[PDB]
Amino acid sequence: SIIRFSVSLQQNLLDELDNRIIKNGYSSRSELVRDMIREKLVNPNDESKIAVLVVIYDHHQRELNQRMIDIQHASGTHVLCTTHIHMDEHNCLETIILQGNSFEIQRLQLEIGGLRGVKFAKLTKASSFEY
Amino acid sequence: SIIRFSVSLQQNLLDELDNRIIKNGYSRSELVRDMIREKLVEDNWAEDESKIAVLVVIYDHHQRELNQRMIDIQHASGTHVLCTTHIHMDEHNCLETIILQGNSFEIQRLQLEIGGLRGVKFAKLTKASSFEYN
Amino acid sequence: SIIRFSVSLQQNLLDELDNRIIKNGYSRSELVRDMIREKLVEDNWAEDESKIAVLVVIYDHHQRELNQRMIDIQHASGTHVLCTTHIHMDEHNCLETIILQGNSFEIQRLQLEIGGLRGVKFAKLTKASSFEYN
Amino acid sequence: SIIRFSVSLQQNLLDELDNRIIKNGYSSRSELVRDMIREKLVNPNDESKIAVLVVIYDHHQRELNQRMIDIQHASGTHVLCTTHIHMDEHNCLETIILQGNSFEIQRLQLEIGGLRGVKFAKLTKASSFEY
Numbered sequence: 355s356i357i358r359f360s361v362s363l364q365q366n367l368l369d370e371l372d373n374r375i376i377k378n379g380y381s382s383r384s385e386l387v388r389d390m391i392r393e394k395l396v397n398p399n400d401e402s403k404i405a406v407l408v409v410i411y412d413h414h415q416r417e418l419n420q421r422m423i424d425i426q427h428a429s430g431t432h433v434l435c436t437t438h439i440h441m442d443e444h445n446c447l448e449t450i451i452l453q454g455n456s457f458e459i460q461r462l463q464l465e466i467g468g469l470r471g472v473k474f475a476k477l478t479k480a481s482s483f484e485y
Numbered sequence: 486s487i488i489r490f491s492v493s494l495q496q497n498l499l500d501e502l503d504n505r506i507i508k509n510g511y512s513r514s515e516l517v518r519d520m521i522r523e524k525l526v527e528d529n530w531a532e533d534e535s536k537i538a539v540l541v542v543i544y545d546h547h548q549r550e551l552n553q554r555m556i557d558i559q560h561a562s563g564t565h566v567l568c569t570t571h572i573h574m575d576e577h578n579c580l581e582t583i584i585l586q587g588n589s590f591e592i593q594r595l596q597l598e599i600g601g602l603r604g605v606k607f608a609k610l611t612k613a614s615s616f617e618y619n
Numbered sequence: 620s621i622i623r624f625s626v627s628l629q630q631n632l633l634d635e636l637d638n639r640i641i642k643n644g645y646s647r648s649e650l651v652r653d654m655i656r657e658k659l660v661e662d663n664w665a666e667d668e669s670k671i672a673v674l675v676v677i678y679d680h681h682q683r684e685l686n687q688r689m690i691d692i693q694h695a696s697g698t699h700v701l702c703t704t705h706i707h708m709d710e711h712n713c714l715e716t717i718i719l720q721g722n723s724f725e726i727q728r729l730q731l732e733i734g735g736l737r738g739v740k741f742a743k744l745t746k747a748s749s750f751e752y753n
Numbered sequence: 754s755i756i757r758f759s760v761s762l763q764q765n766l767l768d769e770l771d772n773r774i775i776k777n778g779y780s781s782r783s784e785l786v787r788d789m790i791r792e793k794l795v796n797p798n799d800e801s802k803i804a805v806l807v808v809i810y811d812h813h814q815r816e817l818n819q820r821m822i823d824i825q826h827a828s829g830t831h832v833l834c835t836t837h838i839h840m841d842e843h844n845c846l847e848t849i850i851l852q853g854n855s856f857e858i859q860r861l862q863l864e865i866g867g868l869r870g871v872k873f874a875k876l877t878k879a880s881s882f883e884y
């Protein structure tokens with residue numbers, strides 16, 4: 355049977371979801387999101403994997419870089435390298451190359467991802483046996 | 486502004502959905518957020534135009550002509566490489582993160598072409614859309 | 620075109636010069652080449668104008684406000700940061716290579732200012748001049 | 754007493770030396786170079802040091818990146834990280850962050866520095882006790 359739950363979205367993502375509802379001919383948020391979920395629905399251990407986090411963050415946010423460096427230092431992952439460029443005057447893009455287990459990597463991602471001024475932290479993992 | 490809205494779903498699917506919240510570090514609201522972002526970015530990349538992405542490649546530097554080949558592909562693709570970081574992982578494996586600017590076709594093509602080369606063991610693209618950061 | 624020319628020198632100084640050829644990996648011609656390049660770059664940086672350099676900094680990330688401080692200094696300097704790479708060396712020490720574009724004053728000032736901060740253990744600039752690469 | 758030896762310079766460096774002779778009021782190559790040497794003249798061991806090579810190289814030179822990667826891989830130094838950007842359409846700039854002893858580091862520098870298409874390879878070293 356049919357059940358109704360609540361989702362919370364940041365404005366920028368909501369606006370885009372609303373535009374996609376219109377461009378693609380959906381009738382509601384509920385309907386498109388349902389179709390997305392249904393489509394998605396179609397892991398974690400102690401092994402060391404190499405990973406990459408791609409982080410876009412707000413340039414004007416004070417102390418953000420410091421907070422990221424501290425987290426990287428505090429992490430139980432081994433961060434090999436961080437590289438930063440400016441995309442525009444509002445945004446910087448960073449790649450973090452790191453080694454750790456699935457739990458350590460996921461924690462880093464969510465920690466960085468939840469900081470104010472971080473637009474996203476997207477993860478790429480490669481396990482030994484897939485290279 | 487985080488905005489609350491409700492979604493309606495069949496219990497059998499809400500149970501499958503809810504089976505993955507903690508597995509993936511998160512509330513239900515957080516896992517669906519990530520699903521939505523992913524699909525909206527895919528959709529954006531499928532349509533209409535200067536995009537940012539990161540290509541992650543793991544490759545064997547012993548393949549004689551591979552790096553120059555990757556460079557030639559990228560030059561002919563029309564994409565701009567903003568920056569590249571390379572880690573010499575071990576005797577064979579190099580990992581690179583290549584920060585790319587261009588049209589979504591050009592960028593996705595560069596990925597496909599590079600992933601097909603002998604010596605390339607891994608090639609995965611991270612896409613970004615301007616609605617995520619403007 | 621490598622061009623041969625001769626130089627004249629007092630033996631006591633040619634002996635000191637020649638004492639350092641092998642010590643530094645090189646013929647006499649190679650060690651003097653490097654000396655000349657260095658002085659010519661210094662001279663170029665002293666005069667008259669968009670320059671490229673790399674700043675290398677080793678610093679303690681436990682100094683509370685240091686990274687933001689470095690960022691504020693750099694923003695107020697007028698220099699453009701093209702790219703930054705950071706290595707988390709150990710519990711305290713971070714090494715960064717900061718690729719800079721700007722006037723030689725601005726860039727040299729940024730170095731001096733950063734080298735004076737508590738927590739900064741090392742700050743050394745690599746200068747380039749357009750005669751080296753145009 | 755006074756002795757006469759030969760130096761060989763790449764054209765771009767010779768041209769610049771000639772311009773400096775004129776701008777600063779020197780009378781000869783021999784005289785300015787002598788004054789440079791005299792000014793300069795006013796080390797290597799097995800300890801691990803952290804170092805950085807800053808390399809500017811010709812973008813159009815084919816197989817150069819490959820040759821650099823191979824050298825970095827073959828080196829007895831531990832190369833932590835390489836980062837590359839384009840300066841212009843003719844030049845790229847790379848930083849190599851590495852650990853090794855003085856002999857290993859110097860060899861890497863000269864190996865990379867002697868490749869066709871490399872405009873320079875400039876070294877920065879920091880020993881443990883100087884940080």
Ligand code: NI
Pocket residue numbers: 560566812839
């Ligand atoms: Ni290129």
Ligand code: NI
Pocket residue numbers: 546571572573574578579580822826
């Ligand atoms: Ni490599």
Ligand code: NI
Pocket residue numbers: 546547575576577826827
């Ligand atoms: Ni190898």
Ligand code: NI
Pocket residue numbers: 413440694700
């Ligand atoms: Ni900035």
Ligand code: NI
Pocket residue numbers: 423427680705706707708712713714
């Ligand atoms: Ni650090």
Ligand code: NI
Pocket residue numbers: 427428680681709710711
């Ligand atoms: Ni620490």
